[PDB]
């Protein structure tokens, strides 16, 4: 009767304990932190309004005498090391332990999201039972970036939402606006729209999570929106595609990719910088636009514009300057101006990012970066600049930390043929200033998302790196040094 004891006395209790410890308690702790934050604001408002006064008339005897912690990286010329050195001045402290991202046994955490704005963050991941398997759950939530006791930023979650079925939720992207963190997700019954595009329905959903939730907020805390109108223009279908976006007033701009019919799409074989490669042919510059040269649809990057005062979502096309296959992308609000980053899974392996000149249409002043390049297969290996037909690579961010010298930071994989050896670097278009490893050279890695902000007026960057050990994310809070020694 031992099987009965295990299945009746322990089993049910372990199951209930697991629910309480991983869902209910964290939720109550998160909400408690929110109550504290909300009360702090209330108290400050009370003081601001009640402690304001003008002198009263002073009555003397019978006569009345009437007499006469964390903020966005915007606006400051912060001090950083901007010289090239070969010492270790980076301190990549690990803060991942504060998030519910540590798995056990055969539990894979994949397709991570991380976004930050105005001291708040959004985080998401998919848990699977890492190449092919059953999805367990999709966890999407928000929180605050806190000042830890030792002056290290840390991520504290306050509000977590899950879908009724994780197998339908793909490529979520987050934008912060007015104390809510809007997450735009693709809804699919055919799996990832990128690979199964010919059967994708094209519908989108949006989740609005409060970053400062109420105990009985209801729709205040986790509102479920649906997009009843999508303005696609020439595109057959559109979807969100990348870590995070920006806010402009009441308009939210999410990273996105459109699915355009290959036969409608036009290109020019005589208008491609292919004359410098001795081992290629002009049509490679067009065939590379799909995930295969004979695909029905091709991918082209853009933005999904969502106006809170309208609401429909509008797909915004990008210029064809250095046109590449639509790949996961990100738009930052950094040092006073929007900055756009695009991953490159195309033949152009060089890091592709720069200042946004216009948003609609999206026109980007791509930087002349000659140093940073993503890893990939021998068909399109690191530092390849020859037009070829391929489709593979990883997302490597590059957040701008100092505009005057155009110095940016992020995590890159220091390998030619494989996605290996993640290194946090600070760099210029033509130089690397300093580097520090986040893993050994024999450890592989995939997606890397970087969000920089000010903590007590100092620059910190949190880099979310997928590191293999089954693969799990790690979050490194890297301080940017003022001195080069």
């Amino acid at each position, epitope marked *: 009767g031992l099987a009965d004891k295990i299945g009746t006395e322990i089993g049910p209790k372990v199951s209930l304990i697991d629910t309480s410890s991983t869902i209910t308690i964290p939720a109550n702790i998160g909400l408690l932190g929110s109550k504290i934050s909300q009360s702090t604001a209330s108290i400050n408002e009370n003081v601001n309004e009640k402690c304001k006064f003008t002198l009263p008339p002073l009555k003397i005897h019978e006569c009345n005498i009437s007499c006469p912690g964390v903020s966005n990286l915007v606006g*400051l*010329p912060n*001090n950083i090391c901007l010289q090239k050195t070969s010492n270790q001045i980076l301190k990549p402290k690990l803060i991942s332990y504060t998030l519910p991202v540590v798995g056990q046994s055969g539990t894979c955490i994949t397709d991570p999201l991380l976004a930050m704005d105005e001291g708040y963050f959004a985080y998401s991941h998919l848990e699977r039972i890492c190449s092919r398997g059953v999805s367990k759950q999709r966890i999407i939530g928000v929180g605050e970036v806190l000042d830890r006791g030792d002056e290290v930023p840390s991520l504290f979650m306050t509000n977590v939402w899950t879908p009724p079925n994780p197998n339908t939720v793909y490529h979520c992207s987050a934008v912060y606006n007015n104390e809510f963190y809007y997450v735009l997700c693709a809804v699919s019954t055919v799996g990832d729209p990128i690979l199964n595009s010919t059967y994708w329905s094209g519908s989108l959903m949006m989740t609005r999570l409060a970053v400062k939730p109420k105990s009985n907020g209801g729709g205040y805390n986790q509102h479920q929106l649906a997009l009843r109108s999508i303005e696609k223009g020439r595109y057959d279908k559109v979807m969100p595609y990348g870590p995070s976006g920006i806010k402009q007033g009441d308009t939210l701009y999410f990273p996105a990719v459109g699915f355009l019919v290959r036969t409608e799409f036009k290109y020019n074989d005589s208008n491609c910088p292919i004359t410098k490669c001795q081992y290629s042919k002009p049509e490679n510059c067009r065939l590379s636009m799909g995930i295969r040269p004979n695909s029905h649809y091709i991918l082209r990057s853009g933005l999904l514009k969502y106006n809170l005062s309208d609401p429909k979502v509008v797909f915004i096309e990008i210029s064809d300057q250095r046109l590449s296959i639509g790949s996961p992308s990100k738009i930052y609000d950094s*040092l*006073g101006q929007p900055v756009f980053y695009q991953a490159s899974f195309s033949w152009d392996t060089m890091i592709k990012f720069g*200042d946004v*000149l216009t948003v609609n249409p999206l026109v980007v002043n791509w930087r002349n970066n000659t140093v940073i390049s993503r890893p990939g297969q021998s068909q399109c290996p690191r530092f390849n600049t020859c037009p070829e037909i391929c489709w593979e690579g990883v997302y490597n961010d590059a957040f701008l930390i100092d505009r*005057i010298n155009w110095i940016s930071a992020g995590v890159f994989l220091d390998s030619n043929q494989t996605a290996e050896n993640p290194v946090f670097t600070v760099f210029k278009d033509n130089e690397i200033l300093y580097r520090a490893q986040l893993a050994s050279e024999d450890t592989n890695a995939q997606k890397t998302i970087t969000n920089c902000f000010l903590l007590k*007026n100092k620059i910190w960057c949190i880099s979310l790196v997928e590191i293999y050990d089954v693969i799990r994310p790690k979050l490194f809070a890297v301080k940017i040094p003022e001195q080069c020694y």
Partner: antibody
Amino acid sequence: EVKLEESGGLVQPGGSMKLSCVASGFSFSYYWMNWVRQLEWVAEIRLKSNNYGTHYRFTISRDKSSVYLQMNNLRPEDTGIYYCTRVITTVFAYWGQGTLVTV
Amino acid sequence: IVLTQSPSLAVLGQRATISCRASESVHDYGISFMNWFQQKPGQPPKLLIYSASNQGSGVPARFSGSGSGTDFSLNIHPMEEDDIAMYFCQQSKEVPYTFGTKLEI
């Protein structure tokens, strides 16, 4: 390539001049613009999001990727070279060629 | 807040030092707001150093600097022929913003 081109530079005392700065190579709508004369700071105008607040006879305004300085009731003390400048996180990183103003 | 700058500097290959004194401290946030520029006849002033010791775009390694509070300086070493110019310190912290010395061989 970032450049600021000034034009509109002799006007007699009591008269007026308007300096027009053409901005290119950057997103004009996201940066503060300032005028400096030769060095002495003259005027600053903030972004639409700051309700075009100004700091300083002269009026500063923005539109065309351009910024303008309206100088009324001119005096000999205003003689010098006026530069159109762009400010990045409080730093006057970019300057135009400059235009000569004589009163 | 106003600035006093000193020395003309009759200084090739030698280290040139230029001092600038603020009437009030300009170091909020731990960030210096004392900037330095290089200016030549026929040309606009070019940013050399912003805040303390941070070089601007295209600025040679020969240019450095330091300072805090009200006491700031520009350090040029070695001085070369191309470094003959007017140098200015700038107060960019508060309105009105304010601002030179002649450095030559």
